[PDB]
Amino acid sequence: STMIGRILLTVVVIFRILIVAIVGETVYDDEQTMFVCNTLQPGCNQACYDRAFPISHIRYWVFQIIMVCTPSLCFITYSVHQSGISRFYIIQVVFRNALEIGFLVGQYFLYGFSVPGLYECNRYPCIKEVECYVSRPTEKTVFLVFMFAVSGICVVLNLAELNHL
Amino acid sequence: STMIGRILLTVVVIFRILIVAIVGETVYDDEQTMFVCNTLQPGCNQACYDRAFPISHIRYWVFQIIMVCTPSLCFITYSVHQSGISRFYIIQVVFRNALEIGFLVGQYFLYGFSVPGLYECNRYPCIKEVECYVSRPTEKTVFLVFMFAVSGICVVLNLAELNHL
Amino acid sequence: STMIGRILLTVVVIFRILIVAIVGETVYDDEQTMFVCNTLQPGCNQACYDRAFPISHIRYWVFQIIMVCTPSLCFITYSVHQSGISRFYIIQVVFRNALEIGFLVGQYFLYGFSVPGLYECNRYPCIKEVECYVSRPTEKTVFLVFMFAVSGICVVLNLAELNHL
Amino acid sequence: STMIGRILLTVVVIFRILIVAIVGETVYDDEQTMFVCNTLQPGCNQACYDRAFPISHIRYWVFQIIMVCTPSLCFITYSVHQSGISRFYIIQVVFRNALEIGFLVGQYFLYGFSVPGLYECNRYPCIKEVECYVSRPTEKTVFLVFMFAVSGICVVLNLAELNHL
Amino acid sequence: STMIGRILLTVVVIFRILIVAIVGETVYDDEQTMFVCNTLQPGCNQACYDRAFPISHIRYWVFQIIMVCTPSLCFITYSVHQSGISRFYIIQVVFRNALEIGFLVGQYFLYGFSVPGLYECNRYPCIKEVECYVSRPTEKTVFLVFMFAVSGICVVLNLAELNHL
Amino acid sequence: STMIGRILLTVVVIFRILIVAIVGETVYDDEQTMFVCNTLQPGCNQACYDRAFPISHIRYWVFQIIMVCTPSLCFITYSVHQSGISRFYIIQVVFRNALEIGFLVGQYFLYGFSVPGLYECNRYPCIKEVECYVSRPTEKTVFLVFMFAVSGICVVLNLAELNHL
Amino acid sequence: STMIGRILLTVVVIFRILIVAIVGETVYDDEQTMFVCNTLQPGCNQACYDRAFPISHIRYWVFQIIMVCTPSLCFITYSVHQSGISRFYIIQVVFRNALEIGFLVGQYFLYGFSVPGLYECNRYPCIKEVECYVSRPTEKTVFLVFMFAVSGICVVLNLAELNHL
Amino acid sequence: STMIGRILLTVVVIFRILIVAIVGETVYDDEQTMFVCNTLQPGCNQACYDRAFPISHIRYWVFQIIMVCTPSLCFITYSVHQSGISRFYIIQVVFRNALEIGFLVGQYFLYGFSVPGLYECNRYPCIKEVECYVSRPTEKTVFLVFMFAVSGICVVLNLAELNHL
Amino acid sequence: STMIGRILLTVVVIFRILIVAIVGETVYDDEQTMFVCNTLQPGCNQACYDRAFPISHIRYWVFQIIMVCTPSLCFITYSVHQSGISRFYIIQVVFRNALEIGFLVGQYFLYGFSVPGLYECNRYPCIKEVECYVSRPTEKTVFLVFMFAVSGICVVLNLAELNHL
Amino acid sequence: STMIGRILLTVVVIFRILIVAIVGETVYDDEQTMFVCNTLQPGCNQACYDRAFPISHIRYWVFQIIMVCTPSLCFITYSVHQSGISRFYIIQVVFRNALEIGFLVGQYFLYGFSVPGLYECNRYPCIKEVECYVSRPTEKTVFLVFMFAVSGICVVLNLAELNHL
Amino acid sequence: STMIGRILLTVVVIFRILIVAIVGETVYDDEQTMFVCNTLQPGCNQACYDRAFPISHIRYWVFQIIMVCTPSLCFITYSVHQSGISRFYIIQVVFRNALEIGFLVGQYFLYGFSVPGLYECNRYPCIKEVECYVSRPTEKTVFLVFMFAVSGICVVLNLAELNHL
Amino acid sequence: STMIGRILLTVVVIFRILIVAIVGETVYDDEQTMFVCNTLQPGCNQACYDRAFPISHIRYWVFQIIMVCTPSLCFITYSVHQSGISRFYIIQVVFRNALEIGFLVGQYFLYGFSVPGLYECNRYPCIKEVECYVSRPTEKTVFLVFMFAVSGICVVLNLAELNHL
């Protein structure tokens, strides 16, 4: 039971990296060029896009993916130099658990569970409130939900292993 | 008879991956930039494109291709770690069969067998119903039919092997 | 005489792959962005481009190139697994001959021997018949003729080897 | 205590290179195409963009990254040719410390800690003072702060090792 | 004297390939997007560009480069299979000489020694004669002259070796 | 003293190649698309850009970089074939010195030490003299100065070694 | 009682002529230039304006005003030539009554009592139904109501005189 | 019976002049500015408008009105100079009859009984046949019918008087 | 004292008519062509202009001027026909007083004392509230104040004469 | 026979004045606003219109009409002052004859008998020869022919009277 | 001396009325349509035109002309009714003098002696200060100076007559 | 001889007034709307039109026509009041002579004898010198020459009468 868990954790991690790396870079490519607002004021599109999308999803996901792989690299570099290992194993597991729980909570607090098609903006130089329109909201919602689903499994597995000890 | 079946399954899988990877990424590249509707309302093109094409074909095909290769990776990782194999062989065959039948059914239910050149849209902010025009419908229909044809062979072969036992 | 034939067949095949792969992808890149019709009707350009160019040359050539290399892969996979070979050799030669004759005939029936600079279109939403103008017709004609020339040699060589037995 | 310091220095350096190389090249790609000023004078956008952004962040960061890796290459080339090493070790550590402190100070003096959304320009051919609007200011501020944070750790670690001797 | 000739021939060939491959692909990239004619007739730009530039320089140079490397590949494939060599050596030298002289003559007859900045066009649908304007004529002239210079050396060297026997 | 000189020459050469190859290709990418003149005459932008920038900096630098590496390749090919070496060593050093001094002088005579923001043009079809505006002049000036600085070191080092004999 | 009736009839007639002649010609002047529809189809504005406004109000009112003054001119011309009068007086009164009742009924049946601000159009070449927007609807409604009010008095007065005999 | 005929002829003539002079000049004012064709060819609108409307209705009607009043002026000038009258009376009646019958026939042969909303044009520089759209067709049809009705009465009356003698 | 009052009343009336008739028709001529709103929605300008200016000032003033001259015309027509006068004099004075007081009150209730330069609009098809800008507000305010001043004198004079009896 | 000639001369003169004054001023009103040339050069339309139409028809006709009425005014002023008359009568007849023959000849030499729809222009700043398109050519041809016809009668009549003496 | 003064006063008054009435109405006709500012903000042109030209010159001059003719009308109406005259003569002279001095002073205080070609504007919605450009400044300056010159003579003459008593 | 001179002077004066009043007002109507310069600078057209045409021809001619009729009005007003005449006759003749000579000289000094089609402008905000293009230069030259011719006759006649005394 504990034998297969490692294999499936490795497979889930590789699957997530592959899915993010191969297709996700090209849904968001036209994010700002097809964002449009009903207005004649110069500079309103920039401010309203910036307020609607402060950090793009793909940047957050790349950062999370890179940051969740550091303890393994540290352990590998230590063992390579060696040529209390168990204490290092315990500590890196603890750190990975903490980092992944923090990242999941931050994702939930930053983005929620949906991307709406309309956005209402009231930032200078826009006069009062204006209405703007988003590109590809359904695909982005699907990607959001898929990533949340993938991220839950890793949390579950790491808690499993934490509790087996 | 059962000897050649494995060889042809491997060849079909590699053929499908190559066809999707090399040429398919560039028919759909201009999907939204050349989508146009007869209207003067800002934001209507975004809503009507989103309603006509919720998930693009190439994303669905990439996802399917990646998801149908996971049991092999699991078996390989297990055997590498080993350094009841037959039970694992049986189970992974069952899982692959199920996944490929599910994906074929989902393709049929999502897209059908044709891409029409006209689309009729009645989503806000569009006033009543408007007419929009699609890019490269014939090429996309050809690609659809080809992919359905390729996908049928794999189902047939996997049922063959399932029934030989 | 039969010794050099294999060497020249291999050289012709590699030459064709290289020519198609390195330069051909960039003559057709602007095929639709510089296609223009004399009209004020929205959606006429899409319909007329689709009727004038149902499948682009480069897609057909990539498909043909990929499909004419499958018997070799099958023979290689069989021999690798082995670790009646002559019957397989005979059959794969027959199949390659048939496939290449079919593809040459299909090319002739699909495209002919020239690409004209003007096209006359009468498809909805275009009113009656309209005149449209093509990009780079001379270069595309040169490419067509070159590909036909290259494809003839392979047919000749394969018939040669078929008849030597 | 001094054992782990080398491992963490190597990990921080690799992390910085990866973060800069993979995602940073694509936030700044549209820096000038979406920069716009409220004016009708030809040539004002060029002058005001040039005055607001004399050297782009990504160029400065690439230059710094490349320049902070030269002492290691020199030491490696020397040792490879060998086939007073300790004096070379001391000197290269001193040089790396100096270079990294200089680069951090220069970053602080060139850019500060924020990127504002508005810029006021009074350069010819602009008449008097004009107002211009920046793209993606929040993301660029986040990147600035992250890079400052990363750069502080290296300074601390190098001072640590300098003082251990 | 005959010893160094082979070394310099190899160096010239590699130099030509590198120069063509690394920089030449990006001077001609905007060839048609910045070609403009003084006219209001739709379709005149396409016809006049096609008449002014029937085959682009870079296509001709790529084709020539690929075609001048075939005899070496043939000799290599023969010798690999072997595991009258001198007759093959003689014949391939003769063929290479002929091909390179033909290609130099064709270059001279196709393009000449300069690219002018203005072009006068009288092709349908253009009314009578119109004036059009070319992009980057000086850089293209420099490239033309450089390529002619490079190509002369190879002819000289091959005639040298032909005459030494 | 002569031991370290070779190491530093190699490091400077590699540094120059890396700096030119990684970042320099993307400052000049938009050189002509953001070049604009105050005029209504068709074709004036092409002529004035061509007169202001006959050969772009990056082309000159790539050519120089490629041409300054040929003597090493010649020496390597000779020594590989060998399987009066000192005379070849002397001669290639002389040739490298000459080539690098020529290239530095040519750079100084072609470009000078600055790129101004305004340019005054009087070429047909422009009527009398017109004013045009350049993109990113400060960054291009910085690059110019940096390249001159890098190029001076190599001249100094090669004269050093020439005079040690 | 019958003495003042003639005086007030004359005053009402003159008042109506003056009101129509002096101000009414300039509310409707921009009727079609400021009529606009939400569409991109050429020719839709013409068809929809024609269907919304078949005959403009001012034309109908001018025609009515001219036609209601003919019996007086006939009586005057007869009496001038004279240089059974009572029978002519009776008959012309009858005819005037009939004409004015007919014109009031026709006005009611042609225009109603209001001019709406929106109009829904489904005439070729408009695709399906489109929405169009009218200029100055409130002023036109006020004019309509005023004219109906003025026209009622004349009917009442003429019936009065008819019944006094 | 013959007494009233003169009075009614005079009233009809004055009515026609007033109707044409006061309102008719302003329906046709925008005849060419709101005429539009579905095309991108310069000069097609001019040719198609000229072919659809060779002589405008209002010019024909003004000419007819002026030409039908000449015999009265001649008779008046003769009688004024006098300070065989019956022969002149007979002859001028004959001439007026002939002129009015000719003008009615010409109207019928020039314009018919309706103005359609669409017109199909095939005149140079228009390519093949194009579709154009007319302004205010219903109002112009109403005016046509009204003028025909008015013109019939005069013919009838003049034949009446001709036959009474 | 009562002698001059009639003279000054006549002079004030003529002055008002002249001022309104000669210059007032040309300040308001461009009222709608230079009215503009900050929006991209078709039809918003029409609705917002109609809501901001339901009846234009000049129409109201023309109507008032015409309506305040009817009692004099009635008295004149009566006296002309005569060829209880004092009762008619009394009654017409009463009626004129009432009409002028009503018109002054209505002016105050319709327009107030100023025309602002900005207007805030929230009528369909405008999304939420939009800002629009008026033409020539200061001149229109001056005209408003002048007309109120002129209208007060007539009220005062008529009350004077009413009270003298 | 000589009695009626004066009456008909007076009628023809008045007819010509009326025809020119009432309708001719409004065919030529849009002469330059709807004149268009196929070109992108600023200033070409002005030069080509000026070369095609140096003096407009209506100016020439107004000038001729005014100049042919001066002898009558002179005779009238003389006779009014009187309060050798026959010598003045003779001389003014001679002068009128001469002036009208001169004007007819000048008309023929200036304009000819037709107005073509196309005009070919080669005046600076137009590059080489360009094609331009005229407005309302058929109506202008009809007017030309009518005016020539009218002008012939006056010449005939004046020669008649000249020869009767 | 006092005899001619009245004649010249009458001639000057009539001259001023004629000059203002015949030509002055058509220099200012395009005052706002050719007023333009260097800005992209909607509504800035309206505010800046209103601030630069609060009341147009021609309105002020028409008002002054009308107001300076009232005392004569009053005297005429009094004398007509008569069918202490000297006291009325004295008083009306006094009033005319006062009115004309007031109007001249007001002209000087409102407009000055010149109309500049540039205007600097800082009114909302304009951002900071913007530059705008006036139409026909020299002609307007000439008109200003001429009107001041004309107005001085009347003041002088009226003071003359005032002092003769 | 002196008898006819007065008659011809009166006829010439009336002819000049008629020619200026009837046709001249409509050649210059589009003077600024069709004036265009080759430039992209806002405000350059206004400055260059103002510098090319400070006072329009028609204004100068109207002013001259009005000013040359004042002595007659003065003499008429004097003689009307009378109900030393010869001294007044002498003086007014002298004044008319002086005024007409002054006006002819001023015309020559202001305008010359031709209107060119091109104008070269160097006024702010135009950068350096720009080229502009005039409307209808030939017609304006014809008008200039005609007016000079007409004006010469009056000078000659007035000198004639001056010298007869």
PDB file of N, CA, C and O in Angstrom, chain H residues 60-91:
ATOM      1  N   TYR H  60     -36.654  67.057 -65.530  1.00  0.00           N
ATOM      2  CA  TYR H  60     -37.659  66.818 -66.561  1.00  0.00           C
ATOM      3  C   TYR H  60     -38.946  67.578 -66.269  1.00  0.00           C
ATOM      4  O   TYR H  60     -39.537  68.186 -67.172  1.00  0.00           O
ATOM      5  N   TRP H  61     -39.384  67.577 -65.010  1.00  0.00           N
ATOM      6  CA  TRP H  61     -40.637  68.245 -64.675  1.00  0.00           C
ATOM      7  C   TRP H  61     -40.520  69.761 -64.800  1.00  0.00           C
ATOM      8  O   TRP H  61     -41.442  70.415 -65.296  1.00  0.00           O
ATOM      9  N   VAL H  62     -39.402  70.340 -64.359  1.00  0.00           N
ATOM     10  CA  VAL H  62     -39.201  71.777 -64.530  1.00  0.00           C
ATOM     11  C   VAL H  62     -39.208  72.143 -66.009  1.00  0.00           C
ATOM     12  O   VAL H  62     -39.843  73.125 -66.422  1.00  0.00           O
ATOM     13  N   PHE H  63     -38.487  71.376 -66.828  1.00  0.00           N
ATOM     14  CA  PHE H  63     -38.455  71.664 -68.260  1.00  0.00           C
ATOM     15  C   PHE H  63     -39.853  71.605 -68.865  1.00  0.00           C
ATOM     16  O   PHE H  63     -40.248  72.491 -69.632  1.00  0.00           O
ATOM     17  N   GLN H  64     -40.610  70.550 -68.548  1.00  0.00           N
ATOM     18  CA  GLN H  64     -41.968  70.428 -69.070  1.00  0.00           C
ATOM     19  C   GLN H  64     -42.839  71.604 -68.644  1.00  0.00           C
ATOM     20  O   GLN H  64     -43.578  72.174 -69.461  1.00  0.00           O
ATOM     21  N   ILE H  65     -42.783  71.967 -67.360  1.00  0.00           N
ATOM     22  CA  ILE H  65     -43.584  73.080 -66.859  1.00  0.00           C
ATOM     23  C   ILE H  65     -43.254  74.364 -67.608  1.00  0.00           C
ATOM     24  O   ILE H  65     -44.151  75.129 -67.979  1.00  0.00           O
ATOM     25  N   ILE H  66     -41.967  74.636 -67.820  1.00  0.00           N
ATOM     26  CA  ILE H  66     -41.599  75.867 -68.514  1.00  0.00           C
ATOM     27  C   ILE H  66     -42.045  75.829 -69.973  1.00  0.00           C
ATOM     28  O   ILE H  66     -42.539  76.829 -70.507  1.00  0.00           O
ATOM     29  N   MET H  67     -41.884  74.684 -70.639  1.00  0.00           N
ATOM     30  CA  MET H  67     -42.199  74.606 -72.064  1.00  0.00           C
ATOM     31  C   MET H  67     -43.698  74.650 -72.349  1.00  0.00           C
ATOM     32  O   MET H  67     -44.101  75.112 -73.421  1.00  0.00           O
ATOM     33  N   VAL H  68     -44.542  74.195 -71.416  1.00  0.00           N
ATOM     34  CA  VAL H  68     -45.988  74.239 -71.646  1.00  0.00           C
ATOM     35  C   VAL H  68     -46.624  75.604 -71.424  1.00  0.00           C
ATOM     36  O   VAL H  68     -47.849  75.721 -71.555  1.00  0.00           O
ATOM     37  N   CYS H  69     -45.851  76.642 -71.093  1.00  0.00           N
ATOM     38  CA  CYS H  69     -46.398  77.982 -70.887  1.00  0.00           C
ATOM     39  C   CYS H  69     -46.010  78.994 -71.966  1.00  0.00           C
ATOM     40  O   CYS H  69     -46.283  80.188 -71.798  1.00  0.00           O
ATOM     41  N   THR H  70     -45.386  78.564 -73.062  1.00  0.00           N
ATOM     42  CA  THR H  70     -44.889  79.491 -74.081  1.00  0.00           C
ATOM     43  C   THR H  70     -45.959  80.076 -75.007  1.00  0.00           C
ATOM     44  O   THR H  70     -45.896  81.271 -75.333  1.00  0.00           O
ATOM     45  N   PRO H  71     -46.941  79.291 -75.464  1.00  0.00           N
ATOM     46  CA  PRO H  71     -47.984  79.877 -76.330  1.00  0.00           C
ATOM     47  C   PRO H  71     -48.755  81.020 -75.691  1.00  0.00           C
ATOM     48  O   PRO H  71     -49.080  82.002 -76.374  1.00  0.00           O
ATOM     49  N   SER H  72     -49.056  80.925 -74.396  1.00  0.00           N
ATOM     50  CA  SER H  72     -49.716  82.035 -73.718  1.00  0.00           C
ATOM     51  C   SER H  72     -48.852  83.287 -73.751  1.00  0.00           C
ATOM     52  O   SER H  72     -49.352  84.388 -74.017  1.00  0.00           O
ATOM     53  N   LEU H  73     -47.554  83.145 -73.478  1.00  0.00           N
ATOM     54  CA  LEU H  73     -46.666  84.300 -73.515  1.00  0.00           C
ATOM     55  C   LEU H  73     -46.615  84.910 -74.910  1.00  0.00           C
ATOM     56  O   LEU H  73     -46.613  86.139 -75.059  1.00  0.00           O
ATOM     57  N   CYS H  74     -46.574  84.068 -75.945  1.00  0.00           N
ATOM     58  CA  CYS H  74     -46.572  84.586 -77.309  1.00  0.00           C
ATOM     59  C   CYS H  74     -47.842  85.376 -77.604  1.00  0.00           C
ATOM     60  O   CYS H  74     -47.788  86.482 -78.157  1.00  0.00           O
ATOM     61  N   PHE H  75     -49.005  84.812 -77.257  1.00  0.00           N
ATOM     62  CA  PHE H  75     -50.259  85.519 -77.500  1.00  0.00           C
ATOM     63  C   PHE H  75     -50.297  86.845 -76.751  1.00  0.00           C
ATOM     64  O   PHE H  75     -50.755  87.863 -77.289  1.00  0.00           O
ATOM     65  N   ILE H  76     -49.808  86.858 -75.510  1.00  0.00           N
ATOM     66  CA  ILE H  76     -49.825  88.085 -74.719  1.00  0.00           C
ATOM     67  C   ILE H  76     -48.930  89.137 -75.358  1.00  0.00           C
ATOM     68  O   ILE H  76     -49.300  90.312 -75.459  1.00  0.00           O
ATOM     69  N   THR H  77     -47.727  88.738 -75.777  1.00  0.00           N
ATOM     70  CA  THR H  77     -46.810  89.692 -76.393  1.00  0.00           C
ATOM     71  C   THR H  77     -47.385  90.253 -77.687  1.00  0.00           C
ATOM     72  O   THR H  77     -47.291  91.460 -77.949  1.00  0.00           O
ATOM     73  N   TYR H  78     -48.025  89.401 -78.493  1.00  0.00           N
ATOM     74  CA  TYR H  78     -48.678  89.891 -79.703  1.00  0.00           C
ATOM     75  C   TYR H  78     -49.758  90.911 -79.369  1.00  0.00           C
ATOM     76  O   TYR H  78     -49.797  92.002 -79.949  1.00  0.00           O
ATOM     77  N   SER H  79     -50.656  90.573 -78.441  1.00  0.00           N
ATOM     78  CA  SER H  79     -51.755  91.487 -78.152  1.00  0.00           C
ATOM     79  C   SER H  79     -51.242  92.796 -77.564  1.00  0.00           C
ATOM     80  O   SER H  79     -51.797  93.866 -77.839  1.00  0.00           O
ATOM     81  N   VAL H  80     -50.183  92.734 -76.752  1.00  0.00           N
ATOM     82  CA  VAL H  80     -49.581  93.951 -76.215  1.00  0.00           C
ATOM     83  C   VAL H  80     -49.015  94.813 -77.336  1.00  0.00           C
ATOM     84  O   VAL H  80     -49.145  96.043 -77.319  1.00  0.00           O
ATOM     85  N   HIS H  81     -48.375  94.185 -78.325  1.00  0.00           N
ATOM     86  CA  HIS H  81     -47.858  94.950 -79.456  1.00  0.00           C
ATOM     87  C   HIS H  81     -48.983  95.563 -80.281  1.00  0.00           C
ATOM     88  O   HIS H  81     -48.828  96.664 -80.824  1.00  0.00           O
ATOM     89  N   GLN H  82     -50.118  94.872 -80.391  1.00  0.00           N
ATOM     90  CA  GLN H  82     -51.219  95.398 -81.192  1.00  0.00           C
ATOM     91  C   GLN H  82     -51.695  96.761 -80.702  1.00  0.00           C
ATOM     92  O   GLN H  82     -52.316  97.500 -81.475  1.00  0.00           O
ATOM     93  N   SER H  83     -51.417  97.115 -79.452  1.00  0.00           N
ATOM     94  CA  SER H  83     -51.922  98.361 -78.882  1.00  0.00           C
ATOM     95  C   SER H  83     -50.960  99.510 -79.160  1.00  0.00           C
ATOM     96  O   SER H  83     -51.380 100.611 -79.518  1.00  0.00           O
ATOM     97  N   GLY H  84     -56.086  88.982 -87.389  1.00  0.00           N
ATOM     98  CA  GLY H  84     -56.511  87.599 -87.281  1.00  0.00           C
ATOM     99  C   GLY H  84     -56.221  87.001 -85.919  1.00  0.00           C
ATOM    100  O   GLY H  84     -55.490  86.017 -85.805  1.00  0.00           O
ATOM    101  N   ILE H  85     -56.799  87.604 -84.878  1.00  0.00           N
ATOM    102  CA  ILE H  85     -56.567  87.129 -83.516  1.00  0.00           C
ATOM    103  C   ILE H  85     -57.108  85.713 -83.347  1.00  0.00           C
ATOM    104  O   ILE H  85     -56.508  84.878 -82.656  1.00  0.00           O
ATOM    105  N   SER H  86     -58.246  85.420 -83.978  1.00  0.00           N
ATOM    106  CA  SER H  86     -58.877  84.118 -83.796  1.00  0.00           C
ATOM    107  C   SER H  86     -58.028  83.000 -84.386  1.00  0.00           C
ATOM    108  O   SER H  86     -57.964  81.903 -83.816  1.00  0.00           O
ATOM    109  N   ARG H  87     -57.358  83.261 -85.510  1.00  0.00           N
ATOM    110  CA  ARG H  87     -56.449  82.264 -86.058  1.00  0.00           C
ATOM    111  C   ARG H  87     -55.324  81.958 -85.081  1.00  0.00           C
ATOM    112  O   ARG H  87     -54.959  80.787 -84.896  1.00  0.00           O
ATOM    113  N   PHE H  88     -54.772  82.991 -84.438  1.00  0.00           N
ATOM    114  CA  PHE H  88     -53.751  82.767 -83.422  1.00  0.00           C
ATOM    115  C   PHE H  88     -54.292  81.957 -82.253  1.00  0.00           C
ATOM    116  O   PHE H  88     -53.595  81.071 -81.739  1.00  0.00           O
ATOM    117  N   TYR H  89     -55.530  82.235 -81.828  1.00  0.00           N
ATOM    118  CA  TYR H  89     -56.126  81.447 -80.753  1.00  0.00           C
ATOM    119  C   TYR H  89     -56.204  79.976 -81.129  1.00  0.00           C
ATOM    120  O   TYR H  89     -55.817  79.110 -80.336  1.00  0.00           O
ATOM    121  N   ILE H  90     -56.699  79.681 -82.328  1.00  0.00           N
ATOM    122  CA  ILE H  90     -56.815  78.295 -82.772  1.00  0.00           C
ATOM    123  C   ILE H  90     -55.450  77.617 -82.767  1.00  0.00           C
ATOM    124  O   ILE H  90     -55.274  76.514 -82.223  1.00  0.00           O
ATOM    125  N   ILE H  91     -54.464  78.279 -83.376  1.00  0.00           N
ATOM    126  CA  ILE H  91     -53.154  77.665 -83.561  1.00  0.00           C
ATOM    127  C   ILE H  91     -52.484  77.402 -82.219  1.00  0.00           C
ATOM    128  O   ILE H  91     -51.869  76.347 -82.019  1.00  0.00           O
TER     129      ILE H  91
END
